[PDB]
């Protein structure tokens, strides 16, 4: 017995939706990362434009 929640494709032999559940959540927390990294820069860039 191998461990689902620990290796891929033992999840996917048991639950095929767990792959597209996983790249739908690696995509969106890669774009929420970009949405917050660009927000922290472009706010304090205009702050750096003043002083």
């Amino acid at each position: 017995k191998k461990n689902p929640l620990k290796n891929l494709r033992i999840m996917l032999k048991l639950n095929p939706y767990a792959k597209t559940m996983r790249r739908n959540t690696i995509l969106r927390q890669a774009r929420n990362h970009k949405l917050r990294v660009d927000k922290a820069a472009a706010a304090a860039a205009a702050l750096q434009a003043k002083s």
């Binding site: 017995k1 461990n3 689902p4 929640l5 999840m11 048991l14 939706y17």
Partner: protein, 112 residues
């Protein structure tokens, strides 16, 4: 109530116990439930022919809760890696032996 610890499990407590400590009884033995052919062959009479259809009838208590639960072997859990508090009095009283109603999910994540 002196001898058990219980409470109300959430959705990845009921998921972490099936995918990691999940075991079945077809006739009389505990098999590792590796394939969906091990749920469908013994319990596909009830429309619940796979693994997450097994987990849907045990989180939301459905019409076929009795046969899906009695299919699962009782979870042979490890000893808790935090340690227990006092083990002999109630969770209200300071110990941990009773109903804790959602803190049981903090305990499953150390038992499992």
């Amino acid at each position: 109530e002196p001898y058990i610890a219980w409470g109300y499990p959430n959705l990845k407590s009921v998921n972490e116990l099936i995918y990691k400590r999940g075991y079945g009884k077809i006739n009389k033995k505990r098999i590792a439930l590796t394939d969906n052919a091990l749920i469908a062959r013994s319990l596909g009479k009830y429309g619940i022919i796979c693994m997450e259809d097994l987990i849907h009838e045990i989180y939301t208590v459905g019409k076929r809760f009795k046969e899906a639960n009695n299919f699962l072997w009782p979870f042979k859990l490890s000893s808790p890696r935090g340690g227990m508090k006092k083990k002999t009095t109630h969770f209200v009283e300071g110990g941990d032996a009773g109903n804790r109603e959602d803190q049981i999910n903090r305990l499953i994540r150390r038992m499992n």
